[PDB]
């Protein structure tokens, strides 16, 4: 019944099994100075004495893996902070990460899942449930049934554990000593539960975490499920030319120069790309090279462009989509003598698209204008 917990109560150790703490230490101060494992990644190694019980060690660890975001990894090259597990006298551990090698003992009698999960509980950050600031609301300490050299092991924390307790006093906590801990004669109780009918019982028979233990671990280590919000829509492009070039450049060795121009043409009065010739002038051809646009997702795009063509000098206006090979999508030989929104629906392999706007003007036949406006790029079927 209660003799299974005897390797938990060492004489020269803080609260029986807390190593690296001074037996009569301020309990508020040592808790505040507790360090946690970055990322919930606890590195470890087994001493040769601890190898003989490796299955029972991996059993307690299996408890953290299955319910929390704590990962027990074997120590590899470059790791400096880790737990060396050995078999000393009884079960015990340092509370939190110490920095450098730290010891955990899993002695004779410490094979039980309860004691493995208990000692590993100290290792990752947790203290004793019986000494919480509010424990006296839930348990009575029969000071007269405790050994006089052992009484500090029951001193509770003073309130002011900033933003209060958080998880409620849990009687099924694997971090809670059973009724006969530190008993003077072994059977007389040192702790009495105030809640009618309740018995804490020993730790070695507890199968791992209770529901409240899991909450504490997941809260300390920010373990969670709350899914991040969905990503914003891909912003559809729309050029105006009213304050910029938009990135659309010209080919070098050409006869015409497509220039960013403010004027009036066929109803509208604003900024549009204009290529124009006079009867007196010379042959002008120009290739407006549009910037490179990504599709981001496996979807059929759509490109819009308002095209203006006027004058007998307009010989030909060609729009082409280039990806890995240049493909012609539109060829306009007839002069519309108006603005016409050209709508090209296109498919996407997996590479960025740029567009070409070619225009040829021969002043031999008369005057001519080729204007370009409202250049849009939507990643959805036209
Ligand atoms: Mg002790
Ligand atoms: Zn303990």
Residue numbers in the entry: 22 to 403
Authors' description from the paper:
Astacins share a basic domain architecture consisting of an N-terminal signal peptide for secretion, a pro-peptide (PP) of variable length for zymogenic latency and the CD. The short paralogue has the basic domain architecture of the family, while the long paralogue further contains an LNK and an MAM domain. Here, we crystallized the zymogen of the long paralogue, hereafter referred to as pLAST-MAM, and solved its crystal structure.
After extensive calculations with the whole molecule and separate domains, the two CDs (N49–C244) could confidently be placed, rebuilt and refined, as well as the respective PPs (defined for E22–K48). In contrast, the LNK (F245–D257) and MAM (F258–C403) moieties were flexible and only those of protomer A could be placed in the structure. The primary activation site of pLAST (K48–N49) is inserted within short helix α2 and buried in the zymogen, thus preventing access by activating enzymes in a similar fashion as found in pro-astacin. Next, N49 would bind the ‘family-specific residue’ immediately after the third zinc-binding histidine (E150; Bode et al., 1993; Gomis-Rüth, 2003), which in turn is held in place by internal salt bridges with R237 and R153 in the zymogen.
